[PDB]
Design an enzyme around this catalytic site. Sequence first.
Site, mmCIF file in Angstrom:
data_model
loop_
_atom_site.group_PDB
_atom_site.id
_atom_site.type_symbol
_atom_site.label_atom_id
_atom_site.label_comp_id
_atom_site.label_asym_id
_atom_site.label_seq_id
_atom_site.Cartn_x
_atom_site.Cartn_y
_atom_site.Cartn_z
ATOM 1 N N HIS A 1 0.809 -1.212 0.000
ATOM 2 C CA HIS A 1 0.000 0.000 0.000
ATOM 3 C C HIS A 1 0.845 1.267 0.000
ATOM 4 N N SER B 1 1.662 -0.564 -7.061
ATOM 5 C CA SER B 1 2.095 -1.586 -7.999
ATOM 6 C C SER B 1 3.064 -1.015 -9.024
ATOM 7 N N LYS C 1 -12.466 -6.366 -14.299
ATOM 8 C CA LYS C 1 -11.403 -7.142 -14.918
ATOM 9 C C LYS C 1 -10.977 -8.317 -14.052
ATOM 10 N N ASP C 2 -11.171 -8.224 -12.734
ATOM 11 C CA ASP C 2 -10.937 -9.363 -11.855
ATOM 12 C C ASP C 2 -11.980 -10.450 -12.047
ATOM 13 N N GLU D 1 4.009 -35.301 -5.152
ATOM 14 C CA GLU D 1 3.124 -34.600 -6.069
ATOM 15 C C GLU D 1 3.941 -33.746 -7.030
HETATM 16 C C1 HEM Z 1 -0.230 -16.752 -1.108
HETATM 17 C C2 HEM Z 1 -0.835 -15.591 -0.950
HETATM 18 C C3 HEM Z 1 -0.447 -14.319 -1.732
HETATM 19 C C4 HEM Z 1 -1.344 -13.358 -1.883
HETATM 20 C C5 HEM Z 1 -2.793 -13.400 -1.362
HETATM 21 C C6 HEM Z 1 -0.753 -12.295 -2.630
HETATM 22 C C7 HEM Z 1 -1.395 -11.137 -2.978
HETATM 23 C C8 HEM Z 1 -0.876 -10.145 -3.758
HETATM 24 C C9 HEM Z 1 -1.627 -9.096 -4.391
HETATM 25 C C10 HEM Z 1 -3.158 -8.927 -4.280
HETATM 26 C C11 HEM Z 1 -0.760 -8.342 -5.069
HETATM 27 C C12 HEM Z 1 -1.049 -7.093 -5.916
HETATM 28 C C13 HEM Z 1 -1.675 -7.438 -7.263
HETATM 29 C C14 HEM Z 1 -0.668 -8.082 -8.167
HETATM 30 O O1 HEM Z 1 0.431 -7.508 -8.337
HETATM 31 O O2 HEM Z 1 -0.962 -9.171 -8.713
HETATM 32 C C15 HEM Z 1 0.561 -8.878 -4.874
HETATM 33 C C16 HEM Z 1 1.718 -8.369 -5.409
HETATM 34 C C17 HEM Z 1 2.975 -8.876 -5.213
HETATM 35 N N1 HEM Z 1 3.266 -10.083 -4.617
HETATM 36 FE FE1 HEM Z 1 1.910 -11.379 -3.717
HETATM 37 N N2 HEM Z 1 0.551 -12.648 -2.908
HETATM 38 C C18 HEM Z 1 0.797 -13.896 -2.369
HETATM 39 C C19 HEM Z 1 2.018 -14.544 -2.475
HETATM 40 C C20 HEM Z 1 3.207 -13.990 -2.936
HETATM 41 C C21 HEM Z 1 4.472 -14.670 -3.155
HETATM 42 C C22 HEM Z 1 4.655 -16.181 -2.903
HETATM 43 C C23 HEM Z 1 5.369 -13.768 -3.616
HETATM 44 C C24 HEM Z 1 6.868 -13.854 -4.017
HETATM 45 C C25 HEM Z 1 7.762 -14.789 -3.687
HETATM 46 C C26 HEM Z 1 4.705 -12.497 -3.683
HETATM 47 C C27 HEM Z 1 5.296 -11.321 -4.098
HETATM 48 C C28 HEM Z 1 4.635 -10.232 -4.613
HETATM 49 C C29 HEM Z 1 5.212 -9.058 -5.233
HETATM 50 C C30 HEM Z 1 6.716 -8.785 -5.444
HETATM 51 C C31 HEM Z 1 4.214 -8.250 -5.596
HETATM 52 C C32 HEM Z 1 4.339 -6.880 -6.294
HETATM 53 C C33 HEM Z 1 4.288 -7.062 -7.801
HETATM 54 C C34 HEM Z 1 4.112 -5.745 -8.497
HETATM 55 O O3 HEM Z 1 3.613 -4.792 -7.863
HETATM 56 O O4 HEM Z 1 4.474 -5.641 -9.690
HETATM 57 N N3 HEM Z 1 3.395 -12.666 -3.273
HETATM 58 N N4 HEM Z 1 0.454 -9.989 -4.071
HETATM 59 C C1 LIG Z 2 -3.326 -4.304 -6.005
HETATM 60 O O1 LIG Z 2 -4.716 -4.565 -5.980
HETATM 61 C C2 LIG Z 2 -5.398 -5.273 -4.939
HETATM 62 C C3 LIG Z 2 -6.321 -6.208 -5.393
HETATM 63 O O2 LIG Z 2 -6.471 -6.403 -6.768
HETATM 64 C C4 LIG Z 2 -7.084 -6.959 -4.513
HETATM 65 C C5 LIG Z 2 -8.078 -7.982 -5.074
HETATM 66 C C6 LIG Z 2 -6.946 -6.791 -3.141
HETATM 67 C C7 LIG Z 2 -7.826 -7.643 -2.181
HETATM 68 C C8 LIG Z 2 -7.072 -8.628 -1.264
HETATM 69 C C9 LIG Z 2 -7.247 -9.964 -1.353
HETATM 70 C C10 LIG Z 2 -8.198 -10.570 -2.392
HETATM 71 C C11 LIG Z 2 -6.489 -10.919 -0.393
HETATM 72 C C12 LIG Z 2 -7.297 -11.000 0.956
HETATM 73 C C13 LIG Z 2 -7.513 -12.486 1.395
HETATM 74 C C14 LIG Z 2 -7.402 -12.868 2.715
HETATM 75 C C15 LIG Z 2 -7.058 -11.841 3.803
HETATM 76 C C16 LIG Z 2 -7.623 -14.353 3.106
HETATM 77 C C17 LIG Z 2 -8.208 -14.467 4.567
HETATM 78 C C18 LIG Z 2 -9.168 -15.674 4.631
HETATM 79 C C19 LIG Z 2 -10.088 -15.798 5.622
HETATM 80 C C20 LIG Z 2 -10.195 -14.734 6.714
HETATM 81 C C21 LIG Z 2 -11.029 -17.036 5.627
HETATM 82 C C22 LIG Z 2 -12.053 -17.003 6.832
HETATM 83 C C23 LIG Z 2 -13.047 -18.166 6.648
HETATM 84 C C24 LIG Z 2 -13.787 -18.664 7.675
HETATM 85 C C25 LIG Z 2 -13.664 -18.086 9.084
HETATM 86 C C26 LIG Z 2 -14.763 -19.847 7.390
HETATM 87 C C27 LIG Z 2 -16.042 -19.755 8.261
HETATM 88 C C28 LIG Z 2 -16.703 -21.162 8.302
HETATM 89 C C29 LIG Z 2 -17.630 -21.476 9.214
HETATM 90 C C30 LIG Z 2 -18.069 -20.433 10.264
HETATM 91 C C31 LIG Z 2 -18.235 -22.889 9.193
HETATM 92 C C32 LIG Z 2 -19.203 -23.127 10.372
HETATM 93 C C33 LIG Z 2 -20.653 -22.917 9.866
HETATM 94 C C34 LIG Z 2 -21.718 -23.214 10.619
HETATM 95 C C35 LIG Z 2 -23.132 -22.971 10.041
HETATM 96 C C36 LIG Z 2 -21.558 -23.785 12.035
HETATM 97 C C37 LIG Z 2 -6.045 -5.846 -2.670
HETATM 98 O O3 LIG Z 2 -5.899 -5.655 -1.291
HETATM 99 C C38 LIG Z 2 -5.274 -5.074 -3.553
HETATM 100 O O4 LIG Z 2 -4.370 -4.160 -2.963
HETATM 101 C C39 LIG Z 2 -4.709 -2.799 -2.954
HETATM 102 C C1 LIG Z 3 9.422 -37.660 -0.651
HETATM 103 C C2 LIG Z 3 7.904 -37.717 -0.794
HETATM 104 C C3 LIG Z 3 7.343 -38.888 -1.263
HETATM 105 C C4 LIG Z 3 5.979 -38.998 -1.411
HETATM 106 C C5 LIG Z 3 5.173 -37.929 -1.087
HETATM 107 C C6 LIG Z 3 5.713 -36.746 -0.618
HETATM 108 N N1 LIG Z 3 4.781 -35.673 -0.301
HETATM 109 N N2 LIG Z 3 4.559 -35.123 0.909
HETATM 110 N N3 LIG Z 3 3.634 -34.190 0.805
HETATM 111 N N4 LIG Z 3 3.229 -34.134 -0.472
HETATM 112 C C7 LIG Z 3 2.219 -33.245 -1.007
HETATM 113 C C8 LIG Z 3 3.931 -35.057 -1.158
HETATM 114 O O1 LIG Z 3 3.820 -35.273 -2.310
HETATM 115 C C9 LIG Z 3 7.097 -36.633 -0.464
HETATM 116 C C10 LIG Z 3 7.750 -35.343 0.046
HETATM 117 O O2 LIG Z 3 8.266 -34.624 -1.045
HETATM 118 C C11 LIG Z 3 8.953 -33.457 -0.689
HETATM 119 C C12 LIG Z 3 9.977 -32.785 -1.395
HETATM 120 C C13 LIG Z 3 10.322 -31.666 -0.604
HETATM 121 N N5 LIG Z 3 9.556 -31.718 0.455
HETATM 122 C C14 LIG Z 3 9.532 -30.789 1.561
HETATM 123 C C15 LIG Z 3 10.347 -29.672 1.573
HETATM 124 C C16 LIG Z 3 10.294 -28.807 2.651
HETATM 125 C C17 LIG Z 3 9.427 -29.061 3.704
HETATM 126 CL CL1 LIG Z 3 9.353 -27.942 5.093
HETATM 127 C C18 LIG Z 3 8.611 -30.180 3.687
HETATM 128 C C19 LIG Z 3 8.667 -31.045 2.611
HETATM 129 N N6 LIG Z 3 8.753 -32.768 0.396
#
Ligand code: HEM
Ligand SMILES: COc1c(O)c(C)c(C/C=C(\C)CC/C=C(\C)CC/C=C(\C)CC/C=C(\C)CC/C=C(\C)CCC=C(C)C)c(O)c1OC
Ligand SMILES: Cc1cccc(-n2nnn(C)c2=O)c1COc1ccn(-c2ccc(Cl)cc2)n1
Lengths: 126, 248, 50, 54, 385, 55, 123, 93, 93
Positions: free
Chosen positions: E202, E206, E228-229, E272
């Site tokens: 923020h 971007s 667009k999303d 996997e």
């Molecule tokens: C798993 C949950 C993740 C969420 C929910 C998430 C979410 C986001 C969002 C919404 C944006 C801005 C929109 C976009 O640029 O596409 C963003 C940008 C970015 N994310 Fe993530 N991200 C995740 C994982 C990661 C990972 C694994 C990496 C890198 C190793 C990463 C690095 C970045 C970077 C560098 C940007 C800025 C890109 C730019 O502004 O050009 N994020 N992320």
């Molecule tokens: C650059 O542009 C962007 C942008 O494009 C977007 C989309 C976002 C929006 C951000 C996102 C889409 C990521 C946010 C996602 C999370 C924070 C994930 C968090 C997930 C949760 C909190 C999951 C919570 C779920 C539960 C608690 C499940 C509830 C289930 C229940 C209660 C089952 C029981 C039911 C009964 C009836 C007993 C930006 O912030 C943004 O930056 C400005």
């Molecule tokens: C060897 C073997 C055989 C069969 C199944 C699986 N496996 N286990 N889980 N899943 C989805 C699978 O396919 C594996 C694990 O393979 C790997 C490779 C690197 N990691 C690893 C790296 C960092 C950390 Cl912190 C934890 C795990 N694990």
Amino acid sequence: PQSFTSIARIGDYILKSPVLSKLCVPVANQFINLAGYKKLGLKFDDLIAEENPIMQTALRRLPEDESYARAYRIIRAHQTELTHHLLPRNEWIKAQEDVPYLLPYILEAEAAAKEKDELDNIEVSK
Amino acid sequence: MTAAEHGLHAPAYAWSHNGPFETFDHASIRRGYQVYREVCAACHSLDRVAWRTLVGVSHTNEEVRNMAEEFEYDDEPDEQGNPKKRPGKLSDYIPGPYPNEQAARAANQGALPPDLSLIVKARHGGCDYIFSLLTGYPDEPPAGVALPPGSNYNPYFPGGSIAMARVLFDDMVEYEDGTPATTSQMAKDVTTFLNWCAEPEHDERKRLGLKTVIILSSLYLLSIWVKKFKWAGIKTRKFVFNPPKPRK
Amino acid sequence: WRTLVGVSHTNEEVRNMAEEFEYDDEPDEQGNPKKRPGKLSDYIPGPYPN
Amino acid sequence: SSLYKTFFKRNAVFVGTIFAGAFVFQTVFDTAITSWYENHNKGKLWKDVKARIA
Amino acid sequence: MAFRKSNVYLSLVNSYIIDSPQPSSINYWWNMGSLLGLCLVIQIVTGIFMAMHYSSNIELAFSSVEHIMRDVHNGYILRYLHANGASFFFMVMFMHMAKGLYYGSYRSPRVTLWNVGVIIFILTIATAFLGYCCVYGQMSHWGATVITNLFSAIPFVGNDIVSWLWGGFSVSNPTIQRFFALHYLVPFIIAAMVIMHLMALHIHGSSNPLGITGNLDRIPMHSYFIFKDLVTVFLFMLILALFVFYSPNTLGHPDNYIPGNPLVTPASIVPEWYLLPFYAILRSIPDKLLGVITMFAAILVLLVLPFTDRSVVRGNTFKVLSKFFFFIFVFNFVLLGQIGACHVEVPYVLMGQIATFIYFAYFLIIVPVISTIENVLFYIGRVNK
Amino acid sequence: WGGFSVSNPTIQRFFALHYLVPFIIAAMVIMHLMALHIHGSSNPLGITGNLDRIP
Amino acid sequence: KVEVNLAAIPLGKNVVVKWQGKPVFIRHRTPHEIQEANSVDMSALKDPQTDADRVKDPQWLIMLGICTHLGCVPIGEAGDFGGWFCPCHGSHYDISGRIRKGPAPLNLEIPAYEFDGDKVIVG
Amino acid sequence: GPPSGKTYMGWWGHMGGPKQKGITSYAVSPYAQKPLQGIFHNAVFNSFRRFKSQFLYVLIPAGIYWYWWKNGNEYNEFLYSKAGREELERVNV
Amino acid sequence: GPPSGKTYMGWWGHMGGPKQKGITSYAVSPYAQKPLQGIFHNAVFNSFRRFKSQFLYVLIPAGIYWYWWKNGNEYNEFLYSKAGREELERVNV
Ligand code: HEM
Ligand SMILES: COc1c(O)c(C)c(C/C=C(\C)CC/C=C(\C)CC/C=C(\C)CC/C=C(\C)CC/C=C(\C)CCC=C(C)C)c(O)c1OC
Ligand SMILES: Cc1cccc(-n2nnn(C)c2=O)c1COc1ccn(-c2ccc(Cl)cc2)n1
Ligand SMILES: CCCCCCCCCCC(=O)OC[C@H](COP(=O)(O)OC[C@H](O)COP(=O)(O)OC[C@@H](COC(=O)CC)OC(=O)CCC)OC(=O)CCCCCCCC
Ligand SMILES: CCCCCCCCCCCCCCCCCC(=O)OC[C@H](COP(=O)(O)OCCN)OC(=O)CCCCCCCCCCCCC
Ligand code: HEM
Ligand code: HEM
Ligand code: HEM
Ligand SMILES: CCCCCCCCCCCCCCC(=O)OCCCOP(=O)(O)OC[C@@H](O)COP(=O)(O)OCCCOC(C)=O
Ligand code: FES
């Protein structure tokens, strides 16, 4: 972030050597034409990343008529890209217009920052 | 590795449940349970399948009640605390032939026949592997192979040496509806019945997938149209530059 | 049985107390049930089957 | 066209007509697909095999 | 002012998804971060509803997953959406990280944003490992045995870490009961790191595919990038529904439908598809302690990338040699996954050793050398001396 | 209940809901502290505190 | 640690007990194969020990099978000498437990069994 | 609240670029335009122009790694056949 | 970022009270003072002054609710004894 003083030090040694200039300069001409920034109406000094205090100093000291022209070339390139087209061929930047207009402001802001570091970490020689 | 250590590759037959709009053939599931009870069930258990899941798939409610009442199950103990027995009901599971796995290996020369409730999903090849195994026993092994005593040759098994002999022979089962019971006919019917035992949700899953794909591909085409409408003002925007006078 | 050692009896005493009861073993090679005397990892048995 | 001017007259639909037409959509869509699916697989279902043993 | 700007809770929504200034020229590669937030919601919701029917004992774990597939109403939908949704979570994350490599998103002033994303990637690999062992199939037992025995090579504390990780002498009942409790918790730690990820985004905004400043031409988030999303959200759900309803077992192994047995070894032990490139790096080092360090250094080498890029231009859009070597790194990552699914045989042993060298030489040798060459070619192609 | 009385499905779903609701309480505590930050605390006199503050 | 007596061993078998969650192989050694165990030269192996440093037992024989390959298991005494032919990669070896025939260069950990007064404790 | 460290982006009105003077822009409402007039020429001519500019940076690395995998796969098949048995013994030592 | 709605507290320098003029304050370092010189007179005299000012607002409601519970507890003990058996039948109808 290499340095613009280091780029000019290596580049001036190549251009003054007679046998290194015949071998490296035709390669550099095909590298620029394959880059394609002149087809979006840009010069190379528009491409330099600017979120650093050396580059913010050089953009303040630029004259006003050149800052207005630079802002138009950047806005025109953002609109051309989102439509996924190129500019018409009569609006491409020519080779004699791609001049380093910003390089003398960069080289004097870097020489002043180096002189401030050698004076703040100096040793007395009594 | 060697191709003998991998096993022969099973070919692709034209099963009538292959395809995104196809169900099981329920007359072949009914015929395949009869080959299970009279041939397979001497050495294989089917432990994940309850009696009640057969009603409305291959038999009626009155038929399954008579099939379950031919086996004996453990009851709650007596008032004196002595054990008791009872016939089967619809909530019971289909029983196996052996009390434990020590008794299973003793009747099969040390080998353990597996449970067949998930055998279609647990082998690479699927229905094509089970059909090719049961019909792929040669009359003689190829020249040079030395089998241990008590093993048989099958080229679809990894290594080529299996502890199960050939079981299926022509006209060993008399079908109810009058189908000729050859080797290939009976091997096709068990494989259809065993695929239902592994995936009993299969007919319902392919009908809910038809509703989901039609709705989600209509929402995808409508969102492309709406996005191009709302972006039309940005995409045709125009810019003009007149350089300012040097008064400044 | 093992929790009594060092609290009220010695290790040699509890081994003789546990070996006066009979417990279920793993079945035979033919699949028949078997019995065995008790060890220190067993629990103290009760008087009734159910 | 003009048939999307007779029902609505230059406006959007409304939020209540969206929710009202969504429930009418569910019962007609579910019936039309179950009819096509069972006609495509005729002769293999249990209700066809149950008739042929009687 | 408007109520969405003055209320304490609505101002956070307004400043992030309504009035947020975005660069005008970002393409569909900038839509992957929105899909990752949808993937995390699907995994948490489908996992909580499955956890009401699951038993984590060693003799009840495999049969309770079979109870979900057969007895629970729409229980096969819950499992197939959960098992295939984990493969879709890793495919979008690989595309999200490769977008940042191509466009220079790791560079200053966005270094803190890159470092928090590396922590998210490590916690997601650990989550998918812990949930895979909770099925207790034949692939679950021998995959947990291989990974936990790697920590016995650490000097003087090898045998104490592995016995504390097992709760005993092998993979047993205490191992599975503690792996399920840790699997419930780590998705909530990932959700807290996603909020810290969005706070660092923020303050600078971007980037854009040209690599230059975007402060001259901005449009707000609402009604341009909200709609667009929606295009990529409906395409994501359509491809995922084709896997859940029409081919639900393509991305799995058939040996995981056999109950786990500590006395029978499978013929092939393979992970996997999304863990296969990191499994081939581990098997290429013949020493046992050096293999564990090298497999964890394959993730931590992404942190050195802000320092080895020596270019004055951000991104690969106008660079010829940087574009060629980016796709060498991409197809080397696919070959490492194919090698990790083969047997240890000639010539796959030498092929996996050369490909492990090319993985590390990209970050440490190739990127700083060709960044310097491109700086000098831009200079002497314009200056006439 | 998941059935006709308090049974096995009742206890297995009560434990999964018991793991989750403490994490919803932790998210409402953060929203509680955000509303406290814009006006600050009160004092036992009931009058304004903007004249005498300590960190 | 499990505790067994002298003549309470399963003698004519290869019982794979799951002691400590680990497969382990147990054999009654008759006193006639001291002539016959070590007629094999250990220079056809990759590293030699003795029978003495391996087997400190005159008439019993134990070795566990947490294998460094992946954790394989053999089949009982058929094959070549009275050893154990394994179906994983085609390994088979001597009556005592030392591998050279088939690709397995090392050999396994022997369990720390211990004798004290008409007892032996595997553990 | 207190202020924080300096940034490179602002908000609406003070975004933080250079001063602009001399540029004028024009637009037209989306309700006054004909719908979807880029469904034909953009999909055929323009997408072909974007494809062939960037296809040699992708297909020359893709052909190197596919030729390498195909020769290693064919050599492993020869080593475990019957004709490749004396080469298997000497590449395994 | 944008600004938000108005508040009644500020920060250091602009806290938001009235303007101050004419008040002067004095303090002395804690390192220059004798340690714990309120352990005797504050604990006996001052805490007694704070106690007896506020003890009738607490002990008059406490004595009402303790008298009420004590008579209801003694009447329930009479109803379930032997002497209170014919009163139990008529207060249960
Ligand atoms: C798993 C949950 C993740 C969420 C929910 C998430 C979410 C986001 C969002 C919404 C944006 C801005 C929109 C976009 O640029 O596409 C963003 C940008 C970015 N994310 Fe993530 N991200 C995740 C994982 C990661 C990972 C694994 C990496 C890198 C190793 C990463 C690095 C970045 C970077 C560098 C940007 C800025 C890109 C730019 O502004 O050009 N994020 N992320
Ligand atoms: C650059 O542009 C962007 C942008 O494009 C977007 C989309 C976002 C929006 C951000 C996102 C889409 C990521 C946010 C996602 C999370 C924070 C994930 C968090 C997930 C949760 C909190 C999951 C919570 C779920 C539960 C608690 C499940 C509830 C289930 C229940 C209660 C089952 C029981 C039911 C009964 C009836 C007993 C930006 O912030 C943004 O930056 C400005
Ligand atoms: C060897 C073997 C055989 C069969 C199944 C699986 N496996 N286990 N889980 N899943 C989805 C699978 O396919 C594996 C694990 O393979 C790997 C490779 C690197 N990691 C690893 C790296 C960092 C950390 Cl912190 C934890 C795990 N694990
Ligand atoms: C796991 C499954 C996830 C599913 C969701 C992921 C989908 C996203 C795929 C990755 C991606 O973002 O690549 C997009 C990129 C094009 O980006 P661009 O902005 O430069 O082009 C704007 C366009 O011209 C106008 O786009 P316009 O707005 O006019 O039309 C929308 C378009 C839908 O496009 C999408 O939804 C994204 C694919 O509608 C049509 O195509 C009409 C035909 C029905 O494409 C390319 O550059 C190369 C294409 C192949 C890349 C695939 C690589 C994957 C390994
Ligand atoms: C821990 C480290 C993890 C790292 C993960 C690495 C593996 C990632 C797997 C996904 C790779 C996909 C690359 C995504 C990078 C996106 C950025 C990009 O490459 O830009 C698109 C490229 C150039 O884009 P321009 O801006 O120059 O102009 C485009 C005009 N059409 O235009 C193009 O050339 C089109 C791009 C097509 C790419 C196809 C190659 C990818 C094939 C992957 C196959 C994998 C399954 C077998
Ligand atoms: C139509 C009848 C039968 C079918 C469809 C059937 C099915 C199967 C299947 C699918 C396997 C596993 C193959 C594999 O793991 O790759 C198997 C193994 C086995 N079956 Fe059968 N079976 C049948 C009848 C019998 C009978 C009558 C016996 C009688 C002894 C028997 C004994 C065994 C044994 C011992 C094995 C284990 C083989 C091994 O592991 O090497 N089966 N059977
Ligand atoms: C980032 C989020 C998550 C990821 C990546 C993930 C990943 C996985 C994976 C790969 C499996 C194995 C699937 C299979 O092959 O059958 C699994 C199983 C499982 N997961 Fe998750 N999971 C996540 C969140 C959760 C949460 C929050 C819960 C519980 C509240 C949960 C509950 C379960 C359960 C009960 C299983 C049991 C086996 C099954 O039902 O398939 N998951 N998880
Ligand atoms: C886990 C639960 C809670 C936590 C962690 C929490 C935390 C806090 C904290 C740290 C303060 C700061 C000032 C102070 O200590 O007075 C505060 C103030 C306050 N809380 Fe809570 N609280 C919780 C529950 C509640 C509940 C149950 C209520 C009322 C029904 C409540 C209402 C208030 C109010 C009105 C204030 C302001 C008091 C004042 O400034 O004079 N809170 N809370
Ligand atoms: C006319 C208007 C119509 C527009 C309609 C459009 C609606 C579209 C909605 C869906 C589109 C995207 C879906 C994602 C979504 O809705 O996300 C919810 C909000 C996004 O997250 P955030 O809470 O803004 O950021 C949340 C974070 O970035 C903020 O971090 P935080 O911790 O909250 O900071 C304060 C710290 C306080 O800490 C303490 C210690 O008190
Ligand atoms: S187990 Fe090591 S080679 Fe067969």
